[PDB]
């Protein structure tokens, strides 16, 4: 039996307007290992760097996904995220609150 | 604290084009420092710590020799490992083994370890002692009794008491600074809208190394765990670590809660609130 | 350091 994704999009420091920060998608506790994880900025793809192939005591995979961002007021932020549990790929929008 | 050193190798058998392809990470506690990745061009074991980059050519030689080696190790072991188990070539399948030393107070090996699984689940594994196994089905006993004949008990106990706590100890005073500074988390809690009759305090742990650290709320001193939401332990980014935890509150009744952080680098346990 | 994986499955 495979195993789903948790998913967590945060920014590295808190986010202030105008301010550049960093912003992480967080994919972990999944199996097998093929998996597609993007951060979206309104909707488009960004080109952020993946982490190195990792995995827990429980065997299940862990990855990184982060680029460099400029929070303001107006910008979406959001990770997608593409698996074999998932028939329809999970989103998660970034908030300053979590 | 009970300092380790780590490996994490993951083979996954690719039919599309007909081959595999073996990525290994190092860590040293909870921090990465090698990777290698049989996909690159030309694979060479890589730093991923700047701690490791002192480390001269013969070091980055004989470690690109070995994964190299394992690599095609974990190649056959994918290829056994599905006439074991009567599967077709037409899937893709995956092949993990990890191992380590724990070092104990006095320099010593306080737990060695070395395990194997197939498609997520636990295939053999060595026992405790380091001088037997134990194997899962059917299938893993095949290969238990081919590492029993061949003795391959002793050679990994050698490593794991040897080998694998020197260069660990050579790690920690490589980069001391770093592997063996306690980084505090920087806390504060905020406050958000919720539902009816219904405010969350949501109190932050960031930037903190190493990953263990210990967050719970209590109302008059007794822990509200039950109704407290707690995140998984987040990567930053740049080494460090996140977490926080969140609970609702009765409107107005938000100074009765308070929230406590016990991490290794803080002197006392740390209490805060809403200010 | 790594170990040296030699034995197959």
């Given at each position: 039996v495979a195993r789903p994704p948790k998913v967590q999009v945060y920014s590295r420091h808190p986010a202030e307007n105008g301010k550049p920060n960093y912003l992480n998608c967080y994919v972990s506790?999944?199996?097998?290992?093929?998996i597609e994880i993007d951060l979206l900025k309104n909707g488009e793809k960004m080109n952020a760097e993946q982490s190195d192939l990792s995995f827990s005591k429980d065997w299940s995979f862990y990855l990184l996904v982060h680029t460099e961002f400029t929070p303001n007021a107006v910008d979406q932020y959001s990770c997608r995220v593409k698996h074999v549990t998932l028939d329809k790929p999970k989103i998660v929008k970034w908030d300053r609150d979590h | 604290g009970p300092h380790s050193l780590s490996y994490f190798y993951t083979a996954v058998s690719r039919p599309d084009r007909g081959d595999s392809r073996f990525i290994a990470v190092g860590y040293v506690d909870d921090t990465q420092f090698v990777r290698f990745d049989s996909?690159?061009?030309?694979?060479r074991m890589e730093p991923?710590?700047?701690?490791?980059?002192?480390?001269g050519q013969d070091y980055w030689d004989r470690e690109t020799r070995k994964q190299r080696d394992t690599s095609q190790t974990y190649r056959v072991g994918l290829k056994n490992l599905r006439g074991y188990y009567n599967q077709s070539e037409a899937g893709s399948h995956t092949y993990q083994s990890m191992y380590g030393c724990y070092l104990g107070?006095?320099?010593?090996?306080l737990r060695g370890y070395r395990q194997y699984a197939y498609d997520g689940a636990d295939y053999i594994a060595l026992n405790e002692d380091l001088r037997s196994w134990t194997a899962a089905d059917t299938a893993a006993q095949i290969t238990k009794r081919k590492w029993e004949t061949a003795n391959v008990a002793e050679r990994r106990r050698s490593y794991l008491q040897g080998l694998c706590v020197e260069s660990l100890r050579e790690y920690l005073e490589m980069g001391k600074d770093t592997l063996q500074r306690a980084e505090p988390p920087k806390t504060h809690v905020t406050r958000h809208p919720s539902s009816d009759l219904g405010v969350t305090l949501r109190c932050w742990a960031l930037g903190?190394?190493?990953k263990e650290i210990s967050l719970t709320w209590q109302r008059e001193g007794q822990?509200?765990?039950?109704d407290m939401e707690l995140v998984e332990t987040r990567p930053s980014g740049d080494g460090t670590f996140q977490k926080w935890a969140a609970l609702v509150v009765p409107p107005?009744?938000?100074?009765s809660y308070t929230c406590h952080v016990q991490h290794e680098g803080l002197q006392e346990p740390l209490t805060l609130r809403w200010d | 350091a790594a170990a040296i994986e030699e034995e197959d499955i």
């Amino acid at each position: 039996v495979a195993r789903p994704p948790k998913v967590q999009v945060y920014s590295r420091h808190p986010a202030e307007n105008g301010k550049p920060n960093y912003l992480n998608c967080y994919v972990s506790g999944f199996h097998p290992p093929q998996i597609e994880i993007d951060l979206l900025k309104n909707g488009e793809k960004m080109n952020a760097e993946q982490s190195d192939l990792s995995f827990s005591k429980d065997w299940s995979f862990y990855l990184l996904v982060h680029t460099e961002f400029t929070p303001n007021a107006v910008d979406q932020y959001s990770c997608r995220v593409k698996h074999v549990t998932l028939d329809k790929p999970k989103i998660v929008k970034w908030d300053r609150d979590h | 604290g009970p300092h380790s050193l780590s490996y994490f190798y993951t083979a996954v058998s690719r039919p599309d084009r007909g081959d595999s392809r073996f990525i290994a990470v190092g860590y040293v506690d909870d921090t990465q420092f090698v990777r290698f990745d049989s996909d690159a061009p030309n694979p060479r074991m890589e730093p991923r710590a700047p701690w490791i980059q002192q480390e001269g050519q013969d070091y980055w030689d004989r470690e690109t020799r070995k994964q190299r080696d394992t690599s095609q190790t974990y190649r056959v072991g994918l290829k056994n490992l599905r006439g074991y188990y009567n599967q077709s070539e037409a899937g893709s399948h995956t092949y993990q083994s990890m191992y380590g030393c724990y070092l104990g107070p006095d320099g010593l090996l306080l737990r060695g370890y070395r395990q194997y699984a197939y498609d997520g689940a636990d295939y053999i594994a060595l026992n405790e002692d380091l001088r037997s196994w134990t194997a899962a089905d059917t299938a893993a006993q095949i290969t238990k009794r081919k590492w029993e004949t061949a003795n391959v008990a002793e050679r990994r106990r050698s490593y794991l008491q040897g080998l694998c706590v020197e260069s660990l100890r050579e790690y920690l005073e490589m980069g001391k600074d770093t592997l063996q500074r306690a980084e505090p988390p920087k806390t504060h809690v905020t406050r958000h809208p919720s539902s009816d009759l219904g405010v969350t305090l949501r109190c932050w742990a960031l930037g903190f190394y190493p990953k263990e650290i210990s967050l719970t709320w209590q109302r008059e001193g007794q822990d509200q765990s039950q109704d407290m939401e707690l995140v998984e332990t987040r990567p930053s980014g740049d080494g460090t670590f996140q977490k926080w935890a969140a609970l609702v509150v009765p409107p107005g009744e938000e100074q009765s809660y308070t929230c406590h952080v016990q991490h290794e680098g803080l002197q006392e346990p740390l209490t805060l609130r809403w200010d | 350091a790594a170990a040296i994986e030699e034995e197959d499955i």
